[PDB]
Structure formats: structure tokens, C-alpha cells
């Protein structure tokens, strides 16, 4: 969000390449006229399991030579993982002074 506020100050919009992701039919029948699996024989829609030292996902577009890690649906990660900082101090002896209390077993 902090990044998005910074682009809105002077920059032009979020790049279209930065916007790519994998009731109603999620298998649409409507998109497949606009990416290649259509009347045009150039079926540019993504296949899968092509082997080779290439990328079968998109991971952005092609770049970032490592692999993309999976954020779980914008759910549990980096909030339970941030909390390790709170737990770091309590599991560490020297960084904590506290007071006298019950010797060194309160915290």
C-alpha cells in the first residue's frame, strides 16, 4: 500500500505486466476469444509441463531468476512471522534486563 501511494504522487499507472494472476465459470468461455485459444490459430494461451530449463509459470513476466514464493491467499504469513520478533526478546536472556522480580524466570 505504501508503494501504491508513492506511484500515485508522480508516476504513471501500475504497469499492466505487474497485473497478471492465475457462481460464475472461472473457466470463462469469454476470455478465450482474447488470448489466442480463439478463431486465430495462434493459440498463445499457456500450456503446462513443457520441461526444459524454462519457466512454466509467469512469475511476473519472465524475470527474477529465482522462483516466486507463495503467499497463502494474502493470509497467514508475516503476521505470525513478525511475531517472532516479540518472541525473540523473551527467548533471549541478555537482550532483556527487566528488573529483579522472580530472578530470571518471569519473562
Amino acid at each position: 500500500l505504501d508503494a501504491l501511494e508513492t506511484m500515485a504522487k508522480d508516476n504513471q499507472p501500475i504497469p499492466p505486466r505487474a497485473m497478471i494472476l492465475s457462481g460464475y465459470e472461472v473457466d470463462y468461455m469469454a476470455r478465450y476469444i482474447s488470448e489466442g485459444g480463439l478463431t486465430g490459430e495462434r493459440k498463445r494461451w499457456v500450456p503446462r509441463r513443457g520441461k526444459t530449463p524454462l519457466d512454466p509459470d509467469v512469475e511476473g513476466f519472465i524475470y527474477s531468476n529465482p522462483v516466486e514464493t507463495s503467499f497463502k491467499q494474502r493470509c497467514l504469513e508475516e503476521w505470525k512471522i513478525r511475531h517472532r520478533k516479540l518472541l525473540r526478546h523473551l527467548r533471549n536472556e541478555g537482550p532483556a534486563v527487566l528488573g529483579a522480580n522472580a530472578s530470571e524466570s518471569d519473562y
Binding site: 492465475s22 465459470e25 472461472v26 473457466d27 493459440k43 509441463r49
Partner: protein
């Protein structure tokens, strides 16, 4: 004549070949011919010099609308068969009053030629099956022909097949043929080539194939199966030859909606790679094959939309072998997709391959299949002593 088959040429040659084979019929001991009034045949200035004895109208449906741009052209061009009629004393009209435009079809030329009607749901017909019963392996028809009421018992399933038998007996009535000869002719055929070919090699699951060049054919067979409700439903789905990618979405939709477990194969893919063809199989209805990417021994047990089962394979031989191998007791085992096509093409290959022969062979190896068969339902199959 008899049982010899002169090699079937392309869909429709010119009238030179037609009249050559007609001379063969005339001077080879034959005294009649059953001619299919194809749209291309009547369109290409052919019926002008053909004397038609009996014109039959079995069923009507809307297809190939690109050629028949308007329903008026479809109803008039197809009515040229009835317009050729000129003598209402040696010629007869067999009409389907079950369809709505039966009088409309009749009125397009010489209505004096008499009208004999067949209809099952519409009992107001000259020939009507007063009693109709259809099962997976049994079929009973008490039909009140103009001669009288007759019992027809056969394993040739299909409600449209009952309509077809009704049309046949009506045609026999047109020439005044006896009911016994009509029954003899009906029972003279037990498996029409490559269409609705029931195979029963000591099994309780009905092997059946159809032409299946359009998704509506699979849809119709699925509705017939619904009318003939078996225990478990498996349908092996072929592919599409050229870049007609708009059919397989709705095809897989009706399959997965009406089949507890589905199956796919690689029947005709002469255009592209089989992997891409298998990818295209799901393109318009609601499920994405990206899960097929992330299997990892964890996605092998999915329950597609309606909790039904997923399906994937390419080797046709193993595909049909496992399809016949699924049949446990009294279930539905469709392995259709091409019909009478006695070969197999995968992009750039041509070899011998018959679906019916492999089906009967698999029914034979069912005896070996009885030695194992744990973990049957979805995936995987055929390998015991690994749990």
C-alpha cells in the same frame, strides 16, 4: 447386395458415380436401393433426374445452419424430397406428425400421395408403440401397426432407435409388407456398423459407441443414458481434429454433469500436439487445468465441481483398456468418440486401431482383471501390492 460392401467413397461424388453404382444395382440382381437424401445431394442439382418411389421423414433437427441461413431454406430444401412426388398411386408418403411441421413438409408438392404417420409420444398415429419399455440390455415394444398389435423384443436400445423402427414399420406398411417380414428384417441386424454398437461379451456393463463428431451427439447419448439410468457412469471422450475449440467446453460440461466419473483420450488430433489438445479440453464452463500443473501426488483425488471425478490420459490403448477395466457390476461404460473409425491418428500417425475389437479383448481379459482391482474409484488403477 447380400453382404459385400463396395468401397465407400467421399461424402458425395457427382451423378456419374451415382449412376454407375445404380447400373451395378440394376444389373447385379438387386431390385431396389435405399438412398440417403443428403443436403449436398439435393442441393447439387441431382434429384431432377431421379424417380423416387417412397419419401420418408424420420426426424427433424437444426444443424449446419451456416449452409441453411434461414429456417425457411432448411424447411424448403429438405422438402424437395416430397416435391419430387408426382404419382399418388404408385408412391407413398411416410411422415412424422410427432414433429411440428409434418403437414408443412407434406404440403410442398402433391399432398394426394397418401400420408402414413409414425409417432411414439403422439399416440394419434397410424403406427404407434402402445407399450414402450427400454432397458440397458432389454427393449420391449407393443406396437399397434395397421395390420394389428405386435410384440417386438430386442436388445437394440435407444429411444430414437424406437422412433427409427417405427419409421421402418411404417415404410413396410406403405408397400403392404407383412408384419412377420418386418420383424425378420428388424432382427436381421444386431449391430449397425460403428453406431450404437452394443457389445455384450459376458458382462453387465453396456459397451456402446457412436459417430460423435459433434458434442450434441454425446449430449444425446447422455440423455439416453439418463433415461436408462445405470449404476455408475463413465464416458471416454475423444478429441477434436482441427481448430474447433468451442465444442469441447460444453462437451465436458454435459459429460461431467451427467457422468459420475469421466474419461478422456486422444482420438483425433491431426492438427497439434496431444498435450495441447488435452489442455484445450476444458475451456468454457468453470474449471481450470492449472491444478493439473500442481499435482504432486496431492491433486490425484479431486472432485470436480459436482463432486464428480477428474480424468486425464493420452495412450489410447491403455485408456480404453482401463475404461473397460473400470466396470464392476451393472454400470455404464461408454468408450465412444469416433464410431466406426477403424484406425487412430495422433498428429502425424496412421495405424490399425479398432475400438470394438479392443473392447471385446478387454472383456476377455476381465478374467485376469478379477485377480486384482483394489482402489477402484477414481485414480490410479491396476497395480496391487502397493498401499
Amino acid at each position: 447386395h447380400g453382404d459385400n460392401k463396395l468401397d465407400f467413397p467421399e461424402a458425395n461424388p457427382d451423378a456419374v458415380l451415382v449412376q454407375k453404382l445404380m447400373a451395378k444395382m440394376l444389373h447385379n440382381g438387386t431390385e431396389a436401393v435405399v438412398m440417403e437424401a443428403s443436403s449436398n445431394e439435393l442441393t447439387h442439382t441431382r434429384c431432377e433426374e431421379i424417380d423416387f418411389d417412397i419419401a420418408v421423414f424420420t426426424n427433424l433437427s437444426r444443424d449446419n445452419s451456416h449452409f441453411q441461413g434461414n429456417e425457411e431454406e432448411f424447411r424448403v430444401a429438405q422438402a424437395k424430397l416430397f416435391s419430387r412426388m408426382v404419382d399418388p398411386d404408385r408412391h407413398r408418403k411416410i411422415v412424422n406428425v410427432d414433429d411440428p411441421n409434418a403437414p408443412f413438409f407434406i404440403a410442398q408438392g402433391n399432398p394426394n400421395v397418401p400420408v402414413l404417420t409414425f409417432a411414439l409420444e403422439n399416440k394419434d398415429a397410424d403406427v404407434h408403440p402402445l407399450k414402450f419399455e427400454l432397458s440397458l440390455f432389454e427393449t420391449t415394444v407393443l406396437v399397434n401397426t395397421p395390420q394389428g398389435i405386435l410384440e417386438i423384443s430386442s436388445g437394440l436400445l435407444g429411444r430414437h432407435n424406437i422412433y427409427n423402427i417405427l419409421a421402418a414399420v411404417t415404410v413396410g406398411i406403405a408397400v403392404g409388407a407383412p408384419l412377420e417380414d418386418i420383424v425378420r428384417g428388424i432382427e436381421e441386424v444386431d449391430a449397425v456398423p460403428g453406431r450404437c454398437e452394443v457389445i455384450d461379451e459376458e458382462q453387465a456393463f453396456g459397451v456402446i459407441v457412436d459417430h460423435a463428431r459433434t458434442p450434441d451427439a454425446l449430449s444425446r447419448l447422455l440423455d439416453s443414458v439418463r433415461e436408462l439410468q445405470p449404476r455408475r457412469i463413465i464416458t471416454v471422450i475423444g478429441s477434436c481434429g482441427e481448430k474447433e475449440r468451442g465444442k469441447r467446453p460444453m462437451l465436458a460440461k454435459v459429460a461431467t454433469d451427467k457422468s459420475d466419473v469421466t474419461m478422456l483420450t486422444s482420438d483425433n488430433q491431426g492438427s497439434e500436439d496431444p498435450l495441447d489438445i488435452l489442455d484445450d479440453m476444458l475451456a468454457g464452463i468453470g474449471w481450470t487445468m492449472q491444478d493439473y500443473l500442481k499435482h504432486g501426488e496431492n491433486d490425484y483425488y479431486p472432485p470436480l465441481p459436482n463432486g464428480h471425478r477428474l480424468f486425464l490420459h493420452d495412450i489410447r490403448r491403455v485408456a480404453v483398456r482401463c475404461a473397460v477395466a473400470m466396470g464392476e457390476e451393472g454400470d455404464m461404460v461408454v468408450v465412444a468418440g469416433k464410431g466406426h473409425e477403424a484406425y487412430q491418428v495422433d498428429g502425424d500417425k496412421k495405424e490399425f486401431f479398432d475400438d470394438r475389437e479392443e473392447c471385446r479383448e478387454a472383456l476377455q481379459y476381465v478374467d485376469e482383471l478379477h485377480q486384482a482391482g483394489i482402489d477402484t474409484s477414481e485414480f490410479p488403477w491396476r497395480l496391487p501390492e502397493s498401499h
